[PDB]
Curated annotation (Swiss-Prot), chain A:
It comes from the Viruses. The gene is 24. Proteolytic cleavage at the N-terminus by the prohead core protein protease gives rise to the mature capsid vertex protein. Homopentamer. Interacts with the portal protein. Interacts with the major capsid protein that forms 160 hexamers. This is Capsid vertex protein. Belongs to the Tevenvirinae capsid vertex family.
From Swiss-Prot, chain B:
This is Major capsid protein. Major capsid protein that self-associates to form hexamers, building most of the capsid in association with pentons made of the capsid vertex protein and one dodecamer of the portal protein. The major capsid protein self-associates to form 160 hexamers, building most of the T=13 laevo capsid. Folding of major capsid protein requires the assistance of two chaperones, the host chaperone groL acting with the phage encoded gp23-specific chaperone, gp31. The capsid also contains two nonessential outer capsid proteins, Hoc and Soc, which decorate the capsid surface. Belongs to the Tevenvirinae major capsid protein family. Homohexamer. Interacts with the portal protein. Interacts with the capsid vertex protein that forms pentamers. Interacts with hoc; one hoc molecule associates with each capsid hexamer. Interacts with soc; this interaction reinforces the capsid structure. A total of 960 subunits of the major capsid protein forms the 160 hexamers. It comes from Enterobacteria phage T4 (Bacteriophage T4). A proteolytic cleavage by the prohead core protein protease gives rise to the mature major capsid protein during virus maturation. Transmembrane segments: none annotated.
Length: 52, 52
């Protein structure tokens, strides 16, 4: 029997940075959520590959 | 649609090199056309006026 644990991340931007990203080519809201997803997905590997 | 835009220019100048210093713009609204460059002025060389 085990008790689940928590992993938390938080980045945030500024509106000015978001405004230019659409102008600069990217899609600011979608991209940022992909930024968190990749790190958290990667952060799981460091919790599994370093647990074995 | 993007910060820090641009705007170009189309200066038209005579002379062998259009970037050398002292080049005179061709279609200048103030300055007159050098109405010898296309003609007799190309054959001979008129001395420039100065003091004394």
């Amino acid at each position: 029997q085990t008790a689940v644990k928590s992993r938390k991340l938080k980045t945030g931007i500024t509106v000015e940075l978001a405004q230019d990203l659409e102008a600069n080519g990217f899609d600011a809201p979608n991209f940022l959520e992909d930024l968190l997803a990749t790190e958290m997905a990667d952060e799981i590997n460091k919790d599994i590959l370093q647990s074995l | 649609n993007s910060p820090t835009g641009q705007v170009f220019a189309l200066r038209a100048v005579y002379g062998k090199d259009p970037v050398a210093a002292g080049a005179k713009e061709a279609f200048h609204p103030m300055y007159g056309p050098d109405a010898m460059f296309s003609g007799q002025g190309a054959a001979k060389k008129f001395p420039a006026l100065a003091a004394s």
